[PDB]
């Protein structure tokens, strides 16, 4: 009601890359494609919220 408006003109996605050595970033790539090296995460709140 108070006349506040917002208008989103453009948007871009950015991504910072660590320049890892290609025979090291391929060993880490190969290690992280196992079923045993799955990157497992957990929500910090860890709660179902009603």
């Amino acid at each position: 009601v108070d006349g506040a408006s917002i208008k989103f003109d453009s948007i871009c996605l950015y991504a910072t890359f660590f320049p890892m050595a290609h025979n090291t970033a391929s060993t880490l790539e190969a290690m992280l494609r196992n079923d045993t090296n799955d990157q497992s995460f957990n929500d910090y709140l860890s709660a179902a919220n009603m």
Binding site: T24, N42, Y44, L45, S46, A47
Partner: peptide, 28 residues
């Protein structure tokens, strides 16, 4: 993997073994 570690002196400055995963939650 001592060629990836910085050298404090002539020994590789490695981390600890058991400091790999996270365990923090909302009070636990």
């Amino acid at each position: 993997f001592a060629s990836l570690a910085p050298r404090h002196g002539s020994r590789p400055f490695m981390g600890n073994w058991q400091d790999i995963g996270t365990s923090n939650m909302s009070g636990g």
